[PDB]
């Protein structure tokens, strides 16, 4: 069924990543999921593409990172760090089923600009993004354009003419 996989040094490597995926789907918070990849690695059973994507499913569907809240939390950076880990560190490449989660988060959060980067990147790698989310992203964009939320307010404020260190708010 599953083709052979080998470590750097050539030792045989396990592919039966089945039960660890269920261990991820049961993760109520999306930081206990990342703590499963450690056990998968330590078992000579590294993660597959389907495994990383289960992790992204929980990064999206879960409510918070841990039981208690966290400062500076962000679902998006978590997902993209998984992608930089999948591609650069390990070599596994993402699929449409992965950028889907990455795009749904930017739609839910409403950060419409980064969404267009995901749309412009899925189209560079040869992926067909769902038009539902593209329409929702453009909807949030037009929405924010009406209310001046297109950019924040602190940037549209006029610049100080004086070169005082206090005026610039350093």
């Amino acid at each position: 069924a599953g083709g052979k996989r080998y470590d750097l040094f050539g030792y045989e490597v396990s592919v039966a990543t089945g039960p660890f995926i269920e261990e991820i789907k049961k993760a109520q918070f999306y930081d206990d999921a990342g703590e499963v990849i450690v056990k998968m690695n330590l078992a000579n059973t590294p993660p597959d593409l389907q495994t990383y994507n289960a992790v992204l499913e929980r990064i999206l569907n879960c409510k918070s990172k841990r039981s208690q809240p966290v400062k500076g939390e962000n679902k998006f950076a978590a997902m993209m760090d998984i992608l930089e880990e999948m591609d650069a560190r390990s070599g596994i490449k993402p699929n449409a089923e992965s950028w889907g989660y990455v795009l749904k988060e930017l739609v839910q959060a409403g950060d419409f600009r980064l969404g267009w980067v995901c749309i412009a990147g899925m189209k560079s790698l040869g992926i067909t993004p769902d038009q539902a989310l593209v329409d929702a992203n453009e909807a949030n964009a037009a929405k924010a354009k009406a209310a001046g939320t297109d950019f924040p307010a602190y940037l549209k404020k006029a610049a100080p003419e004086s070169f005082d260190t206090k005026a610039w708010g350093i």
Binding site: L8, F9, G10, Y11
Partner: protein, 487 residues
């Protein structure tokens, strides 16, 4: 028959002393204590007798959790190391215990580590040449069989690629295996060197490997690191004697072989003579080198990296090492950044076998003429940047062309990196190489352009590239002419 047992009596760092009730074993004899006591196996070699029943022994591992008056088993001999075909494609510590996790090693016999040097009768005074296949080396720096060679290179100068290619060529040309010795090697470089030997198939796990690896790492005490090169060289003396063939012996920096013995001599309490190196400097270094000699039965050549502390050649460790070397393969970042690979700087290099008493006459005169040429090119290079090439006479600009051709012709590819960069490698012979440089020196190949000699091997190989370049440019003209004439 039974085996002898002794009892510890004091522990001071790595040093340990072992009381007996009978005749003490010989010096350099290995003494093992079971792994149940310390938690891991433990070997200590006798160095220094203190009385009729005490035997100071240097320890190669950590002697932590070693109680007093523990039993200590006499091996009956010194450190017996594996030897054979089974050794290849593996890594071994000082004791011959494999550390690559790749199962046991299926060896037949197991030889001791401190073998006496070859007698004078076993020697062969006839100085021979090792056909490296690397024209840059073969022309200017003929690696003498049974000789010691210096390799001066930091980072990003192709040191790894050179030693990999040497292994390959000696495996096919002279039919001889090789062996690596990491003395005080950074444990990161062990991975970066063991994995390069998987992409290059110098270590074909599912096939026939060529080199043995011996890593005595910095995390090991000096009693181990000092006894590493004896291990890697004992692996080579099997191939010299029994297999009856030629061998390379790569030695990560000899500076760290010297430092470790300095540390041993300190721990033993021996008064440091000089800057801090042991009084037994040349002895401990020469007991190693004198085993690296040619024979009637084979040869062991040793390419030795040397670190020069503070760029001072007068320090006793470099200075004593140089007294044993025969050639100096210097590597420079400058030539490397100029596209040349292998990054050898021939003028600052040197050799001992460059004498027609040793080599044939043509090989000598051609090489000395190249040295004259490139030296003159360095001088004229100091003039062109000042005055300009138009300032030079008609005779000078010709050698300014040919010297550039020579320097570009030294650039050679490597079958090691054939997968990485894609280009083939070329094992070029010795005599053919001399006829090539003699053609480029006698001017009978001057119409050929400069860049054709860049990254090729053999005069018979560049001409395909010259034809390829001319055909390509002619096709660009035939493309431009018809693309402009059609419109």
């Amino acid at each position: 028959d039974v085996k002898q047992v002794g009892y510890v009596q004091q522990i001071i760092g790595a040093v340990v002393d072992v009381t007996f009730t009978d005749s003490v074993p010989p010096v350099l004899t290995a003494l093992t204590v079971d792994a149940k006591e310390t938690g891991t196996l433990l070997t200590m070699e006798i160095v220094q007798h203190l009385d009729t029943k005490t035997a100071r022994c240097i320890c190669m591992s950590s002697t932590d959790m070693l109680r007093l008056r523990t039993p200590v088993v006499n091996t009956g001999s010194q450190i017996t190391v594996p030897v054979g075909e089974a050794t290849l494609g593996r890594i071994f510590n000082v004791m011959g215990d494999a550390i690559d996790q790749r199962g046991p090693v299926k060896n037949k016999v197991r030889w001791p580590i401190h073998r006496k040097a070859p007698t004078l009768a076993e020697q062969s005074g006839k100085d021979e040449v090792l056909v490296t296949g690397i024209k840059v080396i073969d022309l200017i720096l003929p690696y003498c069989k049974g000789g010691k060679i210096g390799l001066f290179g930091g980072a990003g100068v192709g040191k790894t690629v050179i030693i990999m290619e040497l292994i390959n060529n000696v495996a096919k040309g002279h039919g001889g295996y090789s062996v690596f010795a990491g003395v005080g090697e950074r444990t990161r470089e062990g991975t970066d060197l063991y994995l390069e030997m998987m992409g290059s198939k110098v270590i074909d796990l599912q096939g026939d490997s060529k080199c043995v690896l011996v890593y005595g790492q910095m995390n090991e005490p000096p009693g181990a690191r000092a006894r590493v090169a004896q291990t890697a060289l004992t692996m080579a003396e099997y191939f010299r004697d029994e297999a009856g063939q030629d061998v390379l012996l790569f030695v990560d920096n000899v500076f760290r072989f010297t430092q470790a013995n300095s540390e041993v001599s300190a721990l033993l309490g021996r008064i440091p003579a000089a800057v801090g190196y042991q009084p037994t400097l040349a002895e401990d270094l020469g007991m190693l080198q004198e085993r690296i000699t040619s024979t009637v039965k084979g040869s062991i050549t040793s390419v030795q990296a040397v670190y020069v502390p503070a760029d001072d050649i007068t320090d006793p460790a470099p200075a004593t090492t140089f007294s044993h070397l025969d050639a100096t393969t210097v590597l420079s970042r400058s030539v490397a950044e100029a596209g040349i690979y292998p990054a050898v700087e021939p003028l600052e290099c040197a050799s001992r076998i460059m004498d027609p008493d040793a080599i044939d006459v043509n090989h000598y005169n051609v090489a000395m003429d190249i040295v004259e040429m490139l030296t003159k090119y360095k001088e004229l290079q100091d003039i062109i940047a000042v005055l300009g090439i138009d300032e030079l006479s008609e005779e000078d600009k010709l050698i300014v062309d040919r010297a550039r051709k020579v320097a570009k012709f030294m650039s050679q590819p490597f079958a090691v990196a054939e997968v990485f960069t894609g280009m083939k490698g070329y094992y070029v012979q010795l005599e053919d190489c001399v006829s090539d440089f003699g053609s480029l020196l006698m001017g009978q190949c001057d119409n050929i352009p400069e860049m054709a000699f860049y990254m090729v091997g053999g005069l018979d190989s560049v001409k395909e590239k010259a034809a390829k370049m001319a055909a390509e440019a002619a096709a660009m003209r035939e493309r431009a002419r018809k693309a402009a004439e059609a419109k």
